[PDB]
């Protein structure tokens, strides 16, 4: 209208979108900094890029900007887009944004007083170590850096207003404990004046449902399927099938932890030295497998059992385990004593091939046992060693 | 021509493009906001982002953009591109986009009135909440909300259309049920004015025919064909390796659906359980396997058969299953008895051996039944359990 | 030189470039669109996003933009850049690309009658529906809808041109079959006036011998491989070990065939019932296997083999198939009787044995020829269904 | 500084940043374009586009931006930035990029006499045509089309100078063997004057050291391992084992050149083919194998061995391959003579049993001669047909 | 303020930001270049190019912005933005970013001495040369080349200050030697003036504790794995089913190497070769097994053993490896005399058995021996041959 167009023209006429709108050029511009956050695009763990949704929110008052509500009636507030008056330079110092600055630009509110506001949203980009030791059980502490890039304190002094976080969309990924924040001020060896920053530290932890059933519960499944090599009989020939095919299985599972894992060097990930374990017994579990058949497929009388060997097997792993099994008229009578003799002989032979499958599955039974406590050890000492395991499981699976 | 030059520039000479369009500076200028949906892009329920095509569609009425038809003949329409006349800063709440806008900016139609029109498009990318605890049996409320920036309802109040469905090209993975929309007021604890919005709630639903055919049936094939470990003779030594090859088969179907499912912790996906309870199925089948087979290969005389045992399996279970099978002349003399007589102990042993067979098989087919009732009625509650699955049937495989 | 900055500079003097450059401001400006296709860059089936290389092609006629040749001798043609000079606002409608413009806006040569010559290129990505009905053997008509964005008939009708096909780079994957357009008029129910709009159909086919030799030789030859389990003896123990072998490696493709189709629900592809068609006949071979191993791993004298059973398999089938085959002295002889006794016995048992084996060769020659014949059906019926087959064969393969 | 300043405000009064800077606006602007090449980024056959890293160089001389040494002392060359000064619309015809420019613009450089000077570098992407008929052992030859848009022969002529080869990083993939230009005039049915165009083909060479290790050796040695399946003897039931499972290891090297090949449709690729013919000569390894265990398991007294069976295998072919191997004392007698009787049978049929196994060995031993003959000299006549590969190899593994 | 205002508007009066601040126009101007290194985003080896989070420091002295501070009390330091002030043109040379500049243009600082200072951030994208030789014990050397594009020695002098390690976030996957930076003239044949540029070499190494636990110990058990066919009884049929699955599983790792791996064929990769002869020894391991079973499964009386063979493998072999096993009474009688004399040579025929068995045995633990000696050093020589080796794992694994 009439007053709104006056008034319009009044503001821009002699101002300058270069000066800070200080009215003593020495007494330093209050800006007070916020932001808004929305939701958590993505956590690239493998570029250490944390992608998020923030609405920033800068306040400070200006004071060419100022105009009185009866001589303009009806209009309480005035609108600049960008290059029209002066706005403070702040931006994230971490951004790894290719543009570096990842705000869109709008306008900004100016009441009758002068008392600016500013509200650019934007899909921020920052870049905050993100440590895998502890993964899936993983608790993270990303920083957002904010701060004037060109002035001090002593002309533009950040002060820090508490994070919102009501509007805030649930990440299904991961659960936002808080966004604590803190001012700083850093001195340069030049000119004893500050430089004050407000930086807000994201508090994040991963949620273990999708990453518990898709890892763990599966490894452990095939683990205790690994383990049914011991129950086989060696009759039939698919011991080793079924061990070379559980680790084959588990080899996908090791590809897939090490798509979905960074390439960070300063540490184990606890999940990865879970896989190992458990990759590493299966591999134990295809040498017994070929011991116990080495065992089984024995030559008869092809060696001689041990007296340490029968004294162990046969005796008191058998008793641990409850074993129980450990002058024509002469020539015919020639001829047909030499089949009963080599039957005699057979049935010796076979004796003894039946004392080596007994040792064969003694040692098959020892080594079930054995495996069993390895792997349920294994597995429960090293899911429980993460810390705030109970709190992820009873929040997630319960 | 001469005219329409008089009239550019006219409307042009005192004009702001700053101040709001109103006669009266304190009344309200009515923008009337709609959409015109032509496409879904993508549903990325990976980064709960729906990339959609939308042309915007804004209607409101200039004051100094008036003129007489008379006193400029010829001329009913004059077009301003962008930075010339005010224009309303709706932009999408919402927007996952790095440049938050998406919209691409053409000129504003005006009428001898003044009344303006404005038709941005653009490949909108909102952030909407994307649950998959039904997938793929899946309907989706996808919320867009528009509202001008840095307007209160008092300035600049918006009036909401109703979408135009008109043109819309049928996107093929996903069935738009419809797109209701409502205009909403939101109030602050400062100044007791509105704040209007209108949002438009995006309601579509998954098709099934093609996840259908590339997950559910060869899930249930490869159930189907790991039943059949149950039917081979124990004699032919390829059991477990039918049994494990066909889970290592089912082992590429879990990570397909690990790599289409979002990381989503909040709830279990409808068939995340069941390729897990296939899964199940099919390593207890492994375990059945390996227990008959144990009980195939028993040693002759290598231990007791229970009462129990025999009572069960080569009794109750036979006949529910139809079962039918549970000088020298005193040397030559002492020499051949015992020919007779191993020939004997062998064919008891053989007796015992074939008893223990029929056992197996008996247990063989005992857990063929149960494994195929298991398996149907696995697989028939979890497909039914969710919601509106008959309607997904009927409208994609009829 | 001297008379061109003078023709520069008196042309740029009262000159508005936003006024539609008319002599009356009532009769329409005639503007002739045309494009000119350069390359198919990708299409895109899986979001139905065409990309294309083209070159625009606009002529309209500036009154404002005369002078004469003798006055300004040695001038012929000026040039202005974006903003300078008035254009029309034709884009495309369904351009599915986020600027919408996908446009490398050039300049606009001028001839001495005031005749603009526009040829703007980019890279356009137009959004058409894509079927997947009869992949790979496909034909698609994909359109480009070009029309002035806030013009009228009656102020800016389009003329049309046909698309200049010289200079097309021939696409390794799509043949170009041809580019008709037509011009249309949509009318509203405002003001009776017409709203052309230019669209061209680019018209293309897939070529096959890619996919042709990457998934249906592949498919064919895997399948007449899986037919070979039924030529194995049964006494290998390895026949399912093939079967399965075989089912996994089609896993694999089906896999392929997933990852290259698009989501589309609205029709089953050709080569995915193809694929499920061996698939099927595969796991029916398996089917097949296992029985065949039951019947030839019977025990003895563990049944009866049934009437119809003999009558069919060992008489009917076998002449179908062309197979043939279907004191003390009294103490020594009761002991030795025994002996030949059991002997007897053990060779009537292998005698019935071998019944049942051959029954199992039988079944096992029996499904070869029926397998083989299922498979050589399907396989010619499914690839001969498609519309032009034979053209994509001959100019494919030959 | 004083000179400076005053030479430059004095340049910028009355210029024209529009018109050509010719001092009779008839004569041409001799325009010197020449390129020079940095680095090859990306060779995409996928979509046949280039991506390369160059910086054009332009030099034309100005009228009007001719000053005096001696009145401007010390300044001897002057920059201008974007839209100051006219520049030359030289671009890439054939871009394929999005922006169609791809050219990062710079200043210009103008020393005393006017002669200006201009160096945009750039990533440009430009489109040629990719053929993959000799892969690995492949020439390309990629070109680049420069030339004015929108300028004549008689008014902006390009002349040619030789491409800048100093400062070329070496690729690891390509080998540069270099980039000739030409120029060449292109004429219309309009105004009979030339359109001269510098265009510079870009001639390189893929090298094979890095293909050949992961896909050329890998199939040799995957094929003669294949080949082995000839030597097993048929007594352990592995064979076919062997054989399906080496070629399951094929399947996913035709996978990975399925991956890496374009979906070219116009001619076979070379190692296509090659793979094709490996995986081939598996497959019939495998079918060989089944007719070799289908002799091997012969029934006893189950049909009778042809006559031309029997002087081919057991004599030709075994000379050939050096095979040598082709009262109550009447009951007593006449109950032992069927014992015998049954022993004499049983070697019998043995012996048949043991020439039915020689035969099968036989048949074992000429496939495997015939198979190692084929195999190589597929190999070698695959590998030798492609052209300059004796070049290849001695330039990348010697 | 009015200060900064009067200030403000003082400075721009009479300013062109084209022109060289300088007093004289022939002294050259010296401008002091630094950077900020701040992390490593991704060394991408497969296009040789390095992007770096770079905050680069410009300082140089402005002659037209001075003022007196006593003058304009308050106001000590003024910022100008893009196209306000003029800037030194410097930008990186070998930049592969798209837009060649990378550099997000911040404000100028200007101290009351007229020293202006420039901080433009930016996510650089260098090309560097990358040899993979000794991967993963790989140390690199990228080059950062800076200077500036069209001034030269006389006019603008590069000089150059040490880069800023303080504020380094450390990489996971490499570590940052240093960066160690040499300002260097390049002189053409025009002028006899230097053109210095300053160029900044980034010395980092990668990290071998991911690789190492993905790469190299998997690769290591995988083949102690395969090792382990010599240890099973021949009497199983699954020593090449074992051979040929770990084949399969090392094919996998090939794969992953591939995909990890660039295209350069100028070098053979360490892991490369370490992979090859991982390979290669499991493929020999499987030729011995064919052998062993060839051997195993010898006809009785089928052939005779070579004197050579039994003087090796059954004495010089067996004792290094210690190896011990190397009237009608008439035809009652001659009827009974054949069963003996079968007997007898069955167990002849057994004993030559025996005999070819431990001859496998004897062959099967050489091989052992032999292979696990092979497989040893191959590892230890490769692993130990890279250059800082012992530092690598000295620092990453302890
Ligand atoms: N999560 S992970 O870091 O990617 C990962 C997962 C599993 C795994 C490793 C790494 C390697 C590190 C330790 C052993 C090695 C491997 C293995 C291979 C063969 C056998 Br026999 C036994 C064990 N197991
Ligand atoms: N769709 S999914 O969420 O990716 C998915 C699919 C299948 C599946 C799971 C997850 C895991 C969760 C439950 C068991 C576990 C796994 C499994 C592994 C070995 C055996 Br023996 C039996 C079962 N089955
Ligand atoms: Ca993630
Ligand atoms: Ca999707
Ligand atoms: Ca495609
Ligand atoms: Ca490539
Ligand atoms: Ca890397």
Chains 1, 2, 3, 4, 5 share one sequence.
Not at 29 to 40: E, N, R
Not at 64 to 80: A, D, I
Not at 203 to 222: A, E, S
Request: net charge negative; glycine share 4%; charged share 20%.
């Amino acid at each position: 209208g009439e007053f709104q167009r006056k008034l319009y023209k009044e503001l821009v006429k002699n101002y300058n979108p270069l000066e800070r709108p200080v009215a003593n050029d020495s007494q330093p511009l209050t800006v007070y900094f916020s932001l808004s956050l929305l939701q958590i695009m993505d956590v690239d763990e493998k570029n250490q890029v944390l992608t998020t949704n923030i609405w920033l929110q800068m306040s400070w008052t200006d004071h060419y900007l100022q105009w009185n509500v009866s001589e303009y009636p009806g209009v309480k507030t005035v609108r600049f887009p960008d290059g029209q008056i002066w706005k403070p330079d702040i931006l994230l110092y971490n951004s790894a944004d290719e543009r570096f600055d990842a705000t869109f630009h709008t306008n900004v509110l100016v009441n009758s007083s002068g008392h600016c506001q500013y509200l650019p949203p934007g899909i921020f980009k920052s870049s905050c170590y993100i440590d895998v030791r502890w993964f899936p059980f993983d608790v993270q502490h990303c920083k957002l850096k904010f701060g004037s890039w060109s002035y001090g304190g002593w002309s533009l002094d950040l002060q820090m207003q508490e994070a919102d976080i009501s509007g805030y969309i649930p990440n299904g990924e991961w659960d936002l404990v808080g966004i604590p924040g803190k001012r700083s001020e850093r001195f340069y060896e030049c000119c004893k004046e500050p430089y004050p920053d407000v930086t807000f530290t994201v508090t994040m932890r991963r949620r273990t449902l999708y990453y518990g059933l898709n890892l763990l519960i599966p490894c452990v499944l095939i683990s205790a399927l690994a383990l049914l090599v011991f129950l086989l009989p060696a009759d039939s020939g698919e011991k080793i099938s079924l061990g070379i095919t559980v680790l084959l299985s588990l080899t996908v599972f090791m590809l897939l932890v090490a798509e979905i894992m960074p390439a960070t060097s300063d540490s184990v990930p606890l999940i990865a030295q879970y896989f190992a374990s458990t990759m590493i017994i299966v591999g134990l579990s295809v040498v017994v497998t070929v011991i116990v058949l080495q065992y089984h497929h024995h030559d008869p009388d092809g060696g001689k059992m041990p007296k340490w060997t029968r004294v162990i097997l046969l005796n008191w792993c058998a008793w641990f385990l409850r074993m129980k099994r450990p002058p024509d008229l002469a020539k015919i009578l020639e001829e047909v004593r030499y089949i009963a003799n080599r039957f005699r002989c057979q049935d010796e032979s076979e004796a003894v091939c039946s004392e080596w499958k007994f040792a064969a599955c003694v040692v098959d039974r020892l080594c079930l046992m054995a495996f069993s406590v390895f792997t349920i050890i294994c597995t429960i000492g090293i899911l429980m060693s993460a810390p705030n395991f109970v709190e992820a499981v009873s929040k997630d699976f319960a």
